RNA sequence: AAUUAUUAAUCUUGAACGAGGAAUGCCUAGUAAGCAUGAUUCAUCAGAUUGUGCUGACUACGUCCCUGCCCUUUGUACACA
């Protein structure tokens, strides 16, 4: 219900059956690997609701 | 016809070889013809593995592994892509 | 010294979110007297983020076939709506519309991923540009469907939708749709 | 679910419709909703109240939107 | 040459239809959609076609899941395939 903000550092690739998901690496200052819906750029900011979780590599 | 020199298995200087049973479909296959795979796996993945470390006594814990030694028949093996169909010249490439 | 509609300033308005700041534009080139600019905003990937925020709103009121291309009518509908928002709950009408944009979009969703051949409805995160697009779209449809076959005019419904959205009350079409998306996403991951 | 708006002003309803003058926002849709009168009536009472300067214009009117407010 | 009413003009009458099930089409910019108009056929008849302009959005900046076509390897008792 409360947000946490992270900074995107680079896009890695696109996942999903129809290619509608984006694989990124983000820093809050630990590093995490997250999976994003919608157009993104390096330097964007994401509001993460669940903190301790990741996505598998591609 | 006669598409393989060894006939699809490795038997020489013998009459009969006892069979085993497929790990996936239960079929009977002679031992010298099944494909053998020996897998060393982990109990849990790397994320749930470090949750067990910090909930543990002994302050230095090593999770045990698993040893399986699965065996398969030709049909139940190439449908799961442990083994693929190759070209005529590549069929001879071992190890 | 430039006002919107010659009445409202946007020289003291802030975002106060720090995530949508770079995505919605009230700044040097976006300061216009009237929301009619014949710009070319869909030629690159992100030039949509430089269009003035109020012009994006008027671009969405011309929907359902019967009203395609009627840009001047949409400018009038929004202009009178901003007047009502000022008359009751006396504040800067554009500041209220900024608050609605920041609260009307979901922060996460769910999508089908076949990672291991098995497909789940595993959840994902939403990008700031996607959040802004959703907020504008959800507000307009709520006002549009509220006024069909009703006494209240299109401009009165729009003003009531914007105030309720920025107040987090669950009487707006936007907030209850946002919560329905996030409830499913929470359930799935 | 039918509306049954009245199409004129009764003797009893005559005094009640004039309090509307003391309203934050004044528009035919709001007048008709509070007093259960037509919209053609709601325009008639605004024109009467506006000419005698009991109601203040909020901005320049249009032929499709006619909001007003109390004088103060 | 107007009856089976060519087409236009005036006064009356005032039906279904409250956004449409299973299915399915075309579209990424002055484009979709909305709006009209020139020309063809033409003694007289456009709800059609072929052009032209006016007002002018939302959404993506991808993918091989569905449908097609192409390439490589593999199997065939098919070659009217
Ligand atoms: Mg024998
Ligand atoms: Mg295919």
Supply the CATH number for residue C146's domain. Answer: 1.10.455.10
Task: State both tokens at D37.
Answer: 């009168």
Q: How many domains does chain C have?
A: 1
User: A17 CB near a chain C CB, below 8 Å?
Assistant: yes
**Are residues A39 and C114, on separate chains, in Cβ contact within 8 Å?**
no
Chain A residue with minimal CA distance to C185?
A49
CA-closest candidate to residue C83, choices C96, C73, C72: C96
Fold type of domain A1-58: OB fold (Dihydrolipoamide Acetyltransferase, E2P) (2.40.50)
Sign of CA dihedral D23, D28, D33, D36: positive
Task: State both tokens at B4.
Answer: 């393989």
d(Cα C97, Cα B53) in Å, to the nearest integer? 50
Cβ-Cβ contacts under 8 Å between C and D: the total is 28
| C176 Cβ neighbours under 8 A, 6+ residues apart | C170
Query: After which residues does chain D break, using C–N > 2.5 Å?
Result: none
Which nucleotides in chain E lie less than 7 Å from some protein C-beta? 29-30, 32-34, 55-65, 73-75
Chain D residue with minimal CA distance to C90?
D24
Give chain D's length. 72
Q: Are D16 and D55 in contact (CB under 8 A)?
A: no
Which 3 state secondary structure label does DSSP give D15? Answer: helix
| B79 Cβ neighbours under 8 A, 6+ residues apart | none
Residue C116's Cα: distance from chain center in Å?
38
Which 3 state secondary structure label does DSSP give C81? Answer: helix
CA separation, residue B37 to residues B41, B71, B74, C13 (Å): 12, 6, 13, 66
Question: Mapped to the 3 state alphabet, what secondary structure does B10-64 carry?
Answer: CCCCCCCCCEEECCCCCCEEECCCCEEECCEEECCCHHHHHHHHCCCCCCCCCCC
User: A16 CB near a chain C CB, below 8 Å?
Assistant: yes
Which 3 state secondary structure label does DSSP give C187? Answer: helix
Probe site for chain C from D4, D23, D67, D71 (most C CB atoms < 10 A)? D67
Report which DSSP code applies to C27: S
Q: A19 beta carbon < 7 A from strand E? A: yes
Report which DSSP code applies to C24: S
Resolution in A: 2.5
Q: Are D58 and D67 in contact (CB under 8 A)?
A: yes
Domain span at residue C32?
1-189
CA-closest candidate to residue C106, choices A50, A47, A32: A47
Task: State both tokens at C55.
Answer: 């012009």
What values do phi and psi take at A6, rounded to 5? Answer: -140, 150
Q: Are C125 and A38 in contact (CB under 8 A)?
A: no
d(Cα D28, Cα D37) in Å, to the nearest integer? 10
Chains contacting C (3+ CB pairs below 8 angstroms): A, D
Q: Are C126 and A45 in contact (CB under 8 A)?
A: no
d(Cα D68, Cα D61) in Å, to the nearest integer? 9
User: A13 CB near a chain C CB, below 8 Å?
Assistant: no
Task: State both tokens at B34.
Answer: 């099944």
Q: C112 beta carbon < 7 A from strand E? A: no
Which 3 state secondary structure label does DSSP give C96? Answer: helix
CA-closest candidate to residue A27, choices A11, A41, A45, A15: A45
CA separation, residue D63 to residues C61, C80, C130, D66 (Å): 20, 12, 38, 7
Q: Are C90 and D69 in contact (CB under 8 A)?
A: no
Task: State both tokens at D63.
Answer: 């032929």
D70: number of CA atoms within 13 Å, CB side?
Answer: 9
Q: Among all chains, which residue has been given the structure tokens 């591609």?
A: A58
d(Cα C179, Cα D8) in Å, to the nearest integer? 45
Chains contacting A (3+ CB pairs below 8 angstroms): C
Q: How many domains does chain B have?
A: 1
- Between helix D39-51 and helix D28-35 the angle, nearest 10°, is 110
Q: Are A55 and A34 in contact (CB under 8 A)?
A: yes
Task: State both tokens at C48.
Answer: 């949509």
Q: Are C133 and C113 in contact (CB under 8 A)?
A: no
CA-closest candidate to residue A54, choices A36, A35, A39: A35
Which 3 state secondary structure label does DSSP give C126? Answer: strand
3-state DSSP percent of chain D in helix, strand and coil, to 5: 45, 10, 45
CB crowding B64-95: b at 16 or more within 10 Å, else e: eeeeeeebbbeebbeeeeeeeeeeeeeeeeee
Query: After which residues does chain A break, using C–N > 2.5 Å?
Result: 28
Task: State both tokens at C14.
Answer: 């802030």
User: D72 CB near a chain C CB, below 8 Å?
Assistant: no
CA separation, residue A37 to residues A26, A41, A47, C76, C179 (Å): 14, 12, 12, 35, 17
Q: What is the CATH number of the domain that holds B2?
A: 3.30.1740.20
Burial of A42 (0-12, 13-18, 19+ CB in 10 A): exposed
d(Cα A4, Cα A33) in Å, to the nearest integer? 15
Report which DSSP code applies to A6: E
Distance C36 CA to E43 C1' (A): 54
CB atoms within 10 A of CB D7: 8
Q: Strands D55-57 and D68-70, how do they pair?
A: antiparallel
Query: CA angle A38-C166-A21, nearest 5°?
Result: 10
The H-assigned helical ranges of C61-153 are 71-87, 93-103, 128-146
d(Cα C166, Cα C85) in Å, to the nearest integer? 12
A12: number of CA atoms within 13 Å, CB side?
Answer: 15
Which 3 state secondary structure label does DSSP give A14? Answer: strand
- Between helix C173-188 and helix C128-146 the angle, nearest 10°, is 130
The approach used to solve this structure was: cryo-EM
Task: State both tokens at C95.
Answer: 């500041």
| A54 Cβ neighbours under 8 A, 6+ residues apart | A32, A33, A34, B47
Residue B88's Cα: distance from chain center in Å?
24
Give chain A's length. 58
Distance B12 CA to E73 C1' (A): 31
CA-closest candidate to residue C135, choices C177, C80, C75: C177
Give chain C's length. 189
Chain C residue with minimal CA distance to D39?
C151
Sign of CA dihedral A17, A22, A25, A29: negative
């Amino acid at each position: 219900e409360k947000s946490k903000l992270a900074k995107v550092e680079k896009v890695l690739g696109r996942t999903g059956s129809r290619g509608g998901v984006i694989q990124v690496r983000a820093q809050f200052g630990r590093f995490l690997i997250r999976n994003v819906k919608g157009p993104v750029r390096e330097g964007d900011i994401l509001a993460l609701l669940e903190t301790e979780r990741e996505a598998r590599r591609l | 016809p006669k598409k393989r020199r060894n006939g699809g298995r490795s038997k020489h200087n013998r009459g009969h070889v006892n069979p085993l049973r497929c790990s996936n479909c239960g079929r009977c296959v002679p031992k010298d013809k099944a494909i053998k795979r020996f897998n060393i796996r982990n109990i849990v993945d790397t994320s749930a593995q470090r949750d067990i470390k910090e909930a543990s006594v002994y302050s230095t814990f090593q999770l045990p592994k698993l040893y399986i030694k699965q065996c398969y028949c030709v049909s139940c093996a190439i449908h799961s892509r442990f083994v693929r169909v190759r070209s005529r010249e590549q069929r001879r490439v071992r190890k | 010294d430039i006002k919107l509609f010659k009445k409202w300033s946007y020289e003291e308005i802030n975002i106060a979110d720090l995530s949508l700041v770079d995505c919605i534009a009230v700044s040097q080139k976006a300061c216009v007297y009237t929301p009619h600019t014949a710009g070319r905003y869909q030629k690159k990937r992100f030039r949509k983020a430089l269009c003035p925020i109020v012009e994006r709103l008027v671009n969405s009121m011309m929907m359902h076939g019967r009203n395609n291309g009627k840009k001047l009518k949409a400018i009038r509908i929004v202009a009178y709506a901003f007047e009502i928002i000022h008359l009751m709950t006396g504040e800067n009408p554009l500041q209220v519309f900024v608050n609605a944009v920041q609260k009307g979009g979901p922060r996460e969703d769910s999508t089908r991923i076949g990672s291991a051949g098995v497909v789940r409805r595993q959840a994902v995160d939403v990008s700031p540009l996607r959040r802004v697009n959703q907020a504008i779209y959800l507000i307009c449809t709520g006002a549009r469907n509220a006024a069909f076959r009703n006494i209240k005019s299109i401009s009165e419904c729009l003003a009531e939708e914007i105030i309720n959205c920025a107040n987090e009350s669950s009487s707006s079409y936007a907030i209850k749709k946002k919560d329905e998306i996030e409830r499913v996403a929470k359930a799935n991951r | 679910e039918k509306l049954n708006h009245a199409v004129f002003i009764d003797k009893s309803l005559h005094s009640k419709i004039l309090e509307c003058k003391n309203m934050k926002v004044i528009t035919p849709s709001a007048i008709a909703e509070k007093y259960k009168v037509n919209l053609s009536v709601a325009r008639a009472v605004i024109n009467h109240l506006a000419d005698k300067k009991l109601i203040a214009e909020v901005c320049v009117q249009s032929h499709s939107q006619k909001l007003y407010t109390k004088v103060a």
